[PDB]
């Protein structure tokens, strides 16, 4: 599942700190059941520091 | 080509071909994608102005330094009197000005749009190139058309040309502001004493 | 100068030298033209 | 390979490739191969403008006290008072060494592109390295371009060090002129006469 | 203009160019006519009655306090007080506004974008501070082309 | 007292049970993540609610949240 591994998407979610700006998906998990299997890298952190979080395909988009 | 500096590398958007192209945009005013179309089109227009300008500040006042036509100076022009209101020939230009700059404005913008006549219309420009508008009101000797490598020297012998008189205008311009003398007597008082007759002495 | 001139283009350095210059500019319009309080120009 | 300091190791950058190489770096200001570039071009035009700063600083004071010439002193020789005013002498320098030193800012960074006279095409200076024109306007006899390289670098390495004697010099008639309040020559002959009491600290 | 007299003409102006000058006057009694301290209140007074012949000479307007007050509503009169200042100002601010934002466009597209705000290249800056001159050209120029704005579907925006 | 509540976008990564002082967290299993595990708050009675479990959590936004409620004298840290 997942739009591709090494995209640029855009996040739908509205309580992420990096809604509506550029990601890089790093993994996909492929496994059923997983709420939030994409795995999007950002290029700035948040206020906890980190710019690992995981998101559904349904918040996220190609761009 | 020649280039405004040897040993600089020339910009991609003036690639040699528009006349006058000496490589020179150091601070990028006609990078992106369709802005060097509009940037030609002001260059003629104020390049035009320019030799419109110099032939009417430099000419009537140089002879009136001979004396044969006492005309008054270019900056004290706009206090003369003539059989119109100095404030009425304003705005009798500017609706002049609304009809002749708006027919160039659908030129830059659509062109080859309106070089037919708005009233008798078997009248037609017959120009091909946006900002050469030929025709018989305009180039009525027939000197815009032939060869694109001769076409582009006239056309580079206009901005060579009228790139000096905006030099030239904003030049008398700045001289009427510190000096309050006019243009041609700045001259002949720089052939007298060059080397006391300079900008840093008249601040 | 790979890492000399790298740290004289940190951003308190280079603060530094451009206020100082900045200041240095300032003061020097203020000797010659002081107490300019309207624009001739 | 002699060095200034001969127990001490010689630096990475100064490999004795360039003329005048000593190994003089203890501050490490050279260390970028950029930088040293532009560093061998600043000390070139600093050899070459001290020695003609010591020709005119203590060649004509020695006339004037042997009584050749009746030229005024190296300090107050701008006080005095010619033909162009001495605030728009400046400027007339600015313009031409806008021409001498901005072509020779091209040649620092793009070698080999301002070595063709633009006027003339034609003339061309017969120059292959950075620092070192050529050509007739600035190597008329031709000692410059030999074909052997070993007598081709040590005169390289005459020029610098009679350079850097001369930067020496002209400092040292600065400082003369600002503890002695005498020409250089005048402080020459008054060392000449009791070496062992005329010094810095005669006071 | 909005009851001020020029400052030309003022008599409370005139009154404060003379109790200036006694005020320094009298501090230049106790020191020697040639002494260093008392060149400095003689380039004092010198600067001082440059000043007072300066504004009344702009066309100032001065109150019935003796002082100078700028007219800031654009009268034809009254440009360099602060229509011809401002647009000197604004021409200078928008200089630092545009080099400034072109300088993150030119770091944000780079390896360590981060590193070069910290560490700000001079080579990089430096050839887009000459560029900072012509800047209205630039601003509207990337404002009719879209480049100035950020379309909102790009822009990080906190919840409702 | 405080209410603690899990939600779904938790990853496993029991940091929120490790910064807890007062023993409110623990791991139970889990199928929606790679863990394969998510985090309860069975004693949310003992829970003093000064959120080191959403401190520690590094999932954006956070997947344990601490509500301020009702206040007793397991949730003001008292010893008198
Ligand atoms: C676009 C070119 C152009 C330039 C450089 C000038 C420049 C000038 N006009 Mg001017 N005018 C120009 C076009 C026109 N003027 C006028 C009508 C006037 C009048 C009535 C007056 C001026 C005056 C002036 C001078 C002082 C104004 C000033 O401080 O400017 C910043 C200045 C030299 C004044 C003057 O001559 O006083 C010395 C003046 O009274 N102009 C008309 C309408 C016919 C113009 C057409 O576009
Ligand atoms: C300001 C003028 C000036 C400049 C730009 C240079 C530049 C140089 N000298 Mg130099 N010198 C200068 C004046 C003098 N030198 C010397 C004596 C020497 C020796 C013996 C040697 C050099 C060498 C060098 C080169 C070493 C690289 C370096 O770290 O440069 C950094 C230096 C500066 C940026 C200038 C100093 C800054 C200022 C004090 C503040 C470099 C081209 C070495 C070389 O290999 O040359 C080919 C070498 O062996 N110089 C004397 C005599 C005391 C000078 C005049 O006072
Ligand atoms: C308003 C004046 C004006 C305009 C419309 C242009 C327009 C053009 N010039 Mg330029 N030119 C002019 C003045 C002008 N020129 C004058 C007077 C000189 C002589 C000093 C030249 C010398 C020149 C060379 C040698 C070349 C250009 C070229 C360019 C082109 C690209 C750069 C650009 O877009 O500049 C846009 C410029 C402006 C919008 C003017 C901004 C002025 C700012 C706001 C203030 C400047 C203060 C001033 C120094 C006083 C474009 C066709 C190149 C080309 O290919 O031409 C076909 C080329 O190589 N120009
Ligand atoms: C855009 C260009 C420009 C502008 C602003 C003007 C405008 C001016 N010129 Mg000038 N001039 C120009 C170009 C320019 N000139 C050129 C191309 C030449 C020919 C080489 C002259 C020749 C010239 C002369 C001979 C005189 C002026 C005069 C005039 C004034 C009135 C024009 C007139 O009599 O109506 C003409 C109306 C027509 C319909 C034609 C006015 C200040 C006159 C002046 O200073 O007032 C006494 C004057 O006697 N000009
Ligand atoms: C130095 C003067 C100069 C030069 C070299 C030219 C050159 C050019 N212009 Mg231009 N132009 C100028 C002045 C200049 N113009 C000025 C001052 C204006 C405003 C009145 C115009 C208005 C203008 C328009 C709008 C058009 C041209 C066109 C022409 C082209 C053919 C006509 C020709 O050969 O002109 C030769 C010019 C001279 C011999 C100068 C005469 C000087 C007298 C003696 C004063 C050519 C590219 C035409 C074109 O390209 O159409 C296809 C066209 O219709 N120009
Ligand atoms: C076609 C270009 C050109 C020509 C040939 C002249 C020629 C002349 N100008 Mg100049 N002038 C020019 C453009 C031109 N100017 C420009 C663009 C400016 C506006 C910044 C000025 C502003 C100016 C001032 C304020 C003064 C002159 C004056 C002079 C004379 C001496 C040069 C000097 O000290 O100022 C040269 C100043 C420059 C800024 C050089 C610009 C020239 C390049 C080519 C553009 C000389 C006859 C002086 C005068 O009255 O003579 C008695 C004087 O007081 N000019
Ligand atoms: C945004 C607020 C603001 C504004 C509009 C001005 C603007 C001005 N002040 Mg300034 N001033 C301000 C804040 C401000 N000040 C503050 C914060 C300080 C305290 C550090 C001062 C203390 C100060 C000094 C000491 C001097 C100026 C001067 C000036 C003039 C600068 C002229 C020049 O070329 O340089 C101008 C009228 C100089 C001047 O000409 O006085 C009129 C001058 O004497 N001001
Ligand atoms: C080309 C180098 C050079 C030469 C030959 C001279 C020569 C002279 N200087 Mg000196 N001087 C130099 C550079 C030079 N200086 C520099 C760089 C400075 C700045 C610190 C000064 C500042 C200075 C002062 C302020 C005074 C002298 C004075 C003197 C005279 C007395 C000697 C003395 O006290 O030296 C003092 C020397 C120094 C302070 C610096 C040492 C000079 C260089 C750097 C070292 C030697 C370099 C090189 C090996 C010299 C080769 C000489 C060779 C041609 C024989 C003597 C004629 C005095 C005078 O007027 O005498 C009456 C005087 O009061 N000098
Ligand atoms: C790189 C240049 C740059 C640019 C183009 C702007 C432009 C913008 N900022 Mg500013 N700003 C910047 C630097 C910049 N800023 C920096 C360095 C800081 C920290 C001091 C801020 C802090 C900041 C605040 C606190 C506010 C703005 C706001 C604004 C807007 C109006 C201008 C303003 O309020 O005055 C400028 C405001 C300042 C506090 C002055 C800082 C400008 C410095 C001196 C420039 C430094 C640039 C240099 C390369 C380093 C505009 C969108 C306002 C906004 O939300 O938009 C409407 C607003 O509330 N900015
Ligand atoms: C290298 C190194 C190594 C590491 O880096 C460390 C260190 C230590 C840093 C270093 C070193 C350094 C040094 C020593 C420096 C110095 C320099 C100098 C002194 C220069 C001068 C230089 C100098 C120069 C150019 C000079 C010039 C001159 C001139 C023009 C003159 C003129 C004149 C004349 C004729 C005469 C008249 O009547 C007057 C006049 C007009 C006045
Ligand atoms: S710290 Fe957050 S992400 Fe980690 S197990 Fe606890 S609730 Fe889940």
Same mark, same amino acid.
């Given at each position: 599942?997942?739009?591709?591994?090494?995209?640029?998407?855009?996040?739908?979610?509205?309580?992420?700190?990096?809604?509506?700006?550029?990601?890089?998906?790093?993994?996909?998990?492929?496994?059923?059941?997983?709420?939030?299997?994409?795995?999007?890298?950002?290029?700035?952190?948040?206020?906890?520091?980190?710019?690992?979080?995981?998101?559904?395909?349904?918040?996220?988009?190609?761009? | 080509?020649?280039?405004?500096?040897?040993?600089?590398?020339?910009?991609?958007?003036?690639?040699?071909?528009?006349?006058?192209?000496?490589?020179?945009?150091?601070?990028?005013?006609?990078?992106?994608?369709?802005?060097?179309?509009?940037?030609?089109?002001?260059?003629?227009?104020?390049?035009?102005?320019?030799?419109?300008?110099?032939?009417?500040?430099?000419?009537?006042?140089?002879?009136?330094?001979?004396?044969?036509?006492?005309?008054?100076?270019?900056?004290?022009?706009?206090?003369?009197?003539?059989?119109?209101?100095?404030?009425?020939?304003?705005?009798?230009?500017?609706?002049?000005?609304?009809?002749?700059?708006?027919?160039?404005?659908?030129?830059?913008?659509?062109?080859?749009?309106?070089?037919?006549?708005?009233?008798?219309?078997?009248?037609?420009?017959?120009?091909?190139?946006?900002?050469?508008?030929?025709?018989?009101?305009?180039?009525?000797?027939?000197?815009?058309?032939?060869?694109?490598?001769?076409?582009?020297?006239?056309?580079?012998?206009?901005?060579?040309?009228?790139?000096?008189?905006?030099?030239?205008?904003?030049?008398?311009?700045?001289?009427?502001?510190?000096?309050?003398?006019?243009?041609?007597?700045?001259?002949?008082?720089?052939?007298?004493?060059?080397?006391?007759?300079?900008?840093?002495?008249?601040? | 100068?790979?890492?000399?001139?790298?740290?004289?283009?940190?951003?308190?350095?280079?603060?530094?030298?451009?206020?100082?210059?900045?200041?240095?500019?300032?003061?020097?319009?203020?000797?010659?033209?002081?107490?300019?309080?309207?624009?001739?120009? | 390979?002699?060095?200034?300091?001969?127990?001490?190791?010689?630096?990475?950058?100064?490999?004795?490739?360039?003329?005048?190489?000593?190994?003089?770096?203890?501050?490490?200001?050279?260390?970028?191969?950029?930088?040293?570039?532009?560093?061998?071009?600043?000390?070139?035009?600093?050899?070459?403008?001290?020695?003609?700063?010591?020709?005119?600083?203590?060649?004509?004071?020695?006339?004037?006290?042997?009584?050749?010439?009746?030229?005024?002193?190296?300090?107050?020789?701008?006080?005095?008072?010619?033909?162009?005013?001495?605030?728009?002498?400046?400027?007339?320098?600015?313009?031409?060494?806008?021409?001498?030193?901005?072509?020779?800012?091209?040649?620092?960074?793009?070698?080999?592109?301002?070595?063709?006279?633009?006027?003339?095409?034609?003339?061309?200076?017969?120059?292959?390295?950075?620092?070192?024109?050529?050509?007739?306007?600035?190597?008329?006899?031709?000692?410059?371009?030999?074909?052997?390289?070993?007598?081709?670098?040590?005169?390289?390495?005459?020029?610098?060090?009679?350079?850097?004697?001369?930067?020496?010099?002209?400092?040292?008639?600065?400082?003369?002129?600002?503890?002695?309040?005498?020409?250089?020559?005048?402080?020459?002959?008054?060392?000449?006469?009791?070496?062992?009491?005329?010094?810095?600290?005669?006071? | 203009?909005?009851?001020?007299?020029?400052?030309?003409?003022?008599?409370?102006?005139?009154?404060?160019?003379?109790?200036?000058?006694?005020?320094?006057?009298?501090?230049?009694?106790?020191?020697?006519?040639?002494?260093?301290?008392?060149?400095?209140?003689?380039?004092?007074?010198?600067?001082?009655?440059?000043?007072?012949?300066?504004?009344?000479?702009?066309?100032?307007?001065?109150?019935?306090?003796?002082?100078?007050?700028?007219?800031?509503?654009?009268?034809?009169?009254?440009?360099? !007080?602060?229509?011809?200042?401002?647009?000197?100002?604004?021409?200078?601010?928008?200089?630092?506004?545009?080099?400034?934002?072109?300088?993150?466009?030119?770091?944000?597209?780079?390896?360590?974008?981060?590193?070069?705000?910290?560490?700000?290249?001079?080579?990089?800056?430096?050839?887009?501070?000459?560029?900072?001159?012509?800047?209205?050209?630039?601003?509207?120029?990337?404002?009719?082309?879209?480049?100035?704005?950020?379309?909102?579907?790009?822009?990080?925006?906190?919840?409702? | 007292?405080?209410?603690?509540?899990?939600?779904?976008?938790?990853?496993?990564?029991?940091?929120?049970?490790?910064?807890?002082?007062?023993?409110?967290?623990?791991?139970?299993?889990?199928?929606?993540?790679?863990?394969?595990?998510?985090?309860?708050?069975?004693?949310? !009675?003992?829970?003093?609610?000064?959120?080191?479990? !959403?401190?520690?959590?590094?999932?954006?936004?956070?997947?344990?949240?601490?509500?301020?409620?009702?206040?007793?004298?397991?949730?003001?840290?008292?010893?008198?």
């Amino acid at each position: 599942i997942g739009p591709k591994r090494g995209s640029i998407v855009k996040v739908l979610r509205r309580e992420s700190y990096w809604f509506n700006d550029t990601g890089k998906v790093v993994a996909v998990d492929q496994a059923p059941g997983v709420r939030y299997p994409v795995v999007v890298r950002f290029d700035k952190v948040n206020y906890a520091g980190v710019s690992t979080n995981n998101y559904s395909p349904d918040e996220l988009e190609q761009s | 080509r020649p280039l405004w500096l040897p040993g600089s590398e020339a910009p991609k958007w003036l690639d040699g071909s528009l006349p006058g192209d000496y490589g020179f945009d150091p601070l990028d005013l006609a990078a992106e994608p369709g802005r060097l179309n509009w940037m030609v089109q002001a260059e003629l227009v104020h390049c035009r102005w320019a030799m419109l300008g110099a032939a009417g500040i430099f000419i009537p006042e140089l002879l009136t330094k001979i004396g044969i036509l006492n005309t008054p100076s270019w900056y004290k022009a706009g206090d003369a009197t003539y059989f119109a209101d100095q404030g009425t020939l304003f705005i009798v230009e500017l609706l002049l000005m609304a009809w002749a700059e708006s027919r160039r404005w659908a030129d830059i913008a659509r062109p080859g749009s309106v070089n037919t006549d708005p009233i008798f219309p078997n009248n037609k420009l017959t120009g091909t190139d946006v900002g050469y508008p030929g025709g018989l009101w305009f180039d009525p000797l027939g000197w815009g058309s032939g060869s694109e490598d001769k076409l582009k020297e006239i056309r580079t012998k206009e901005v060579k040309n009228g790139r000096l008189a905006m030099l030239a205008v904003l030049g008398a311009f700045v001289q009427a502001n510190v000096t309050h003398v006019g243009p041609i007597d700045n001259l002949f008082a720089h052939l007298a004493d060059p080397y006391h007759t300079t900008i840093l002495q008249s601040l | 100068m790979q890492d000399v001139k790298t740290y004289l283009s940190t951003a308190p350095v280079l603060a530094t030298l451009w206020f100082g210059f900045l200041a240095g500019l300032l003061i020097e319009i203020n000797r010659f033209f002081p107490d300019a309080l309207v624009l001739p120009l | 390979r002699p060095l200034w300091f001969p127990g001490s190791q010689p630096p990475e950058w100064l490999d004795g490739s360039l003329p005048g190489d000593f190994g003089f770096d203890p501050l490490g200001l050279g260390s970028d191969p950029e930088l040293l570039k532009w560093f061998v071009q600043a000390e070139l035009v600093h050899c070459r403008w001290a020695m003609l700063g010591a020709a005119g600083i203590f060649i004509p004071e020695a006339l004037t006290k042997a009584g050749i010439l009746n030229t005024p002193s190296w300090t107050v020789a701008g006080d005095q008072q010619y033909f162009t005013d001495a605030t728009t002498l400046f400027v007339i320098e600015i313009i031409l060494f806008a021409w001498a030193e901005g072509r020779r800012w091209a040649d620092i960074i793009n070698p080999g592109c301002v070595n063709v006279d633009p006027v003339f095409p034609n003339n061309k200076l017969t120059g292959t390295d950075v620092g070192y024109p050529g050509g007739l306007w600035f190597d008329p006899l031709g000692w410059g371009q030999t074909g052997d390289a070993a007598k081709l670098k040590d005169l390289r390495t005459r020029e610098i060090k009679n350079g850097r004697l001369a930067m020496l010099a002209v400092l040292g008639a600065v400082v003369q002129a600002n503890y002695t309040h005498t020409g250089p020559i005048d402080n020459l002959l008054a060392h000449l006469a009791d070496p062992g009491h005329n010094t810095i600290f005669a006071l | 203009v909005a009851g001020l007299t020029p400052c030309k003409e003022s008599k409370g102006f005139a009154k404060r160019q003379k109790q200036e000058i006694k005020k320094l006057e009298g501090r230049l009694k106790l020191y020697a006519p040639d002494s260093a301290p008392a060149l400095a209140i003689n380039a004092t007074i010198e600067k001082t009655k440059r000043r007072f012949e300066f504004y009344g000479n702009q066309g100032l307007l001065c109150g019935t306090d003796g002082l100078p007050h700028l007219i800031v509503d654009g009268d034809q009169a009254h440009l360099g !007080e602060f229509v011809y200042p401002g647009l000197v100002f604004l021409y200078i601010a928008g200089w630092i506004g545009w080099v400034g934002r072109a300088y993150l466009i030119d770091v944000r597209t780079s390896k360590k974008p981060t590193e070069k705000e910290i560490i700000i290249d001079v080579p990089l800056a430096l050839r887009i501070m000459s560029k900072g001159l012509t800047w209205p050209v630039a601003a509207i120029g990337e404002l009719r082309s879209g480049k100035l704005v950020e379309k909102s579907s790009n822009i990080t925006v906190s919840p409702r | 007292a405080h209410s603690v509540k899990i939600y779904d976008t938790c990853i496993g990564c029991t940091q929120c049970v490790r910064a807890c002082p007062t023993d409110v967290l623990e791991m139970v299993p889990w199928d929606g993540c790679k863990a394969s595990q998510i985090a309860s708050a069975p004693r949310t !009675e003992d829970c003093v609610g000064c959120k080191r479990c !959403e401190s520690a959590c590094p999932t954006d936004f956070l997947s344990v949240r601490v509500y301020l409620g009702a206040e007793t004298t397991r949730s003001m840290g008292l010893a008198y």
